Design an enzyme around this catalytic site. Structure first.
Site, short mmCIF file in Angstrom:
data_model
loop_
_atom_site.label_atom_id
_atom_site.label_comp_id
_atom_site.label_asym_id
_atom_site.label_seq_id
_atom_site.Cartn_x
_atom_site.Cartn_y
_atom_site.Cartn_z
CD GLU A 142 -2.90 1.55 0.80
OE1 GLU A 142 -3.44 2.68 0.86
OE2 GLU A 142 -3.41 0.58 0.18
CG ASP A 144 3.55 6.53 -3.48
OD1 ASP A 144 4.29 5.87 -4.24
OD2 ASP A 144 2.63 7.28 -3.87
CG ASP A 184 2.25 1.57 -3.80
OD1 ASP A 184 1.21 0.94 -4.09
OD2 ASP A 184 2.48 2.74 -4.20
CG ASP A 188 2.01 6.55 -6.86
OD1 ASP A 188 2.81 6.13 -6.01
OD2 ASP A 188 1.42 5.79 -7.66
NE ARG A 234 2.73 0.44 -13.56
CZ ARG A 234 1.75 0.17 -12.71
NH1 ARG A 234 1.62 0.88 -11.60
NH2 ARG A 234 0.89 -0.82 -12.96
#
EC number: 4.2.2.2
Length: 354
Positions: A142, A144, A184, A188, A234
């Protein structure tokens, strides 16, 4: 206290989206009483409590977000590991060993947060002590390392290093016949955030790293002189937002045992990417399979001019995308990608390199 960092009060370069429709100066307008040197999480949260007042927070050594107390479970980790950085804040690491562990730095625009600079600090990705079991499909981590959320605009990340560090994925344990994923995303940027510049940074050893969008006409992110080493996927994956990526270094291996290289750019819904002079050194990646660096999802805009793959100019214009047409509002100097430039950017990337 005392201003000890020579670079603390400088703002973002005029190059980049973080300098469009306003400049990103962080806490450069801070008074002497709003200059700090913090050695732990308590001192860090106390200085951050200065609110939206201009503040310069100099990081000395390692900041253990857990406060030396291991998170008992999800609830505990949720309540103690997420540190909100307020408006007009400059978090700048001192020396070459300033770093954060066991937590996430959050730039939340809910209170109107904007004008934040995070610089010269190493953020070791947090380990989720209690991952949630997904619908018959593996475990879900979960937390970051850094999340820009809820309308937070004008953020500049410079000379920052994000890495799995002490706990890489090859050390994951397996629970119920599935890999117990405790990591995670790295960085983001979502929910209508906008005007961001990421420069001279390093994302080293991580899986799902940079996800932009999670909107129409927002999320403008510029990335230059960064290094993405042993990053699975990513770098970044974008939706509802245009990114400008030039003179960056991506180094991986399509057959890496831990962070097997998948792709760098993810083209999502209403997402656009302008790539220029990027260096791609991916082992086990055939020249005829170059379009692997760009993965399409629900988007269609992607253009590349002057990028290299394993030392040879690559043509990534026939990968199945429409041309990036919007203009870049600011002037910039894209240097031709050479062995020399890629090496120099690698030397300069990350914290401790200011």
């Amino acid at each position: 206290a005392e201003l000890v960092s020579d670079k603390a009060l400088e703002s973002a370069p005029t190059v980049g989206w973080a300098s469009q429709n306003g400049f990103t100066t962080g806490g450069a307008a801070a008074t002497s009483d709003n200059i700090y040197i913090v050695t732990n999480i308590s001192e860090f949260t106390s200085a951050l409590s200065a609110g939206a007042e201009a503040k310069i927070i100099q990081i000395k050594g390692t900041i253990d977000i857990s406060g030396g107390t291991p998170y008992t479970d999800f609830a505990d980790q949720k309540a103690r590991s997420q540190i909100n950085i307020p408006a007009n804040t400059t978090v700048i690491g001192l020396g070459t060993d300033a770093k954060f562990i066991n937590g996430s730095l959050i730039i939340d625009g809910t209170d109107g947060t904007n004008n934040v600079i995070i610089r010269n600090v190493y953020i070791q990705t947090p380990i989720d002590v209690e991952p949630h079991y997904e619908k018959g499909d593996g475990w879900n981590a979960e937390w970051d390392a850094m999340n820009i959320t809820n309308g937070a605009h004008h953020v500049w990340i410079d000379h920052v290093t994000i890495s799995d560090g002490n706990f890489t994925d090859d050390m994951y344990t397996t629970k119920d016949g599935e890999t117990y994923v405790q990591h995670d995303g790295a960085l983001d940027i979502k929910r209508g955030s906008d005007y961001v510049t990421i420069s001279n940074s390093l994302i080293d050893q991580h899986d799902k790293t940079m996800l932009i969008g999670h909107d129409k006409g927002k999320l403008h992110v510029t990335l230059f002189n960064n290094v993405f080493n042993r990053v699975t996927e990513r770098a970044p994956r974008v939706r509802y937002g245009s990114i400008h990526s030039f003179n960056n270094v991506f180094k991986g291996d399509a057959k890496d045992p831990v962070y097997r290289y998948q792709y760098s750019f993810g083209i999502g819904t209403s997402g656009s990417v302008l790539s220029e002079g990027n260096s791609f050194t991916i082992a086990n990646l055939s020249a005829s399979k170059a379009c692997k660096v760009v993965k399409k999802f629900n988007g269609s805009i992607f253009s590349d001019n002057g990028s290299v793959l394993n030392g040879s100019a690559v043509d990534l214009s026939g990968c199945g995308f429409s041309a990036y047409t919007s203009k870049i509002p600011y002037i910039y100097d894209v240097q031709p990608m050479t062995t020399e430039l890629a090496q120099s950017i690698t030397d300069n990337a990350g914290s401790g390199k200011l």
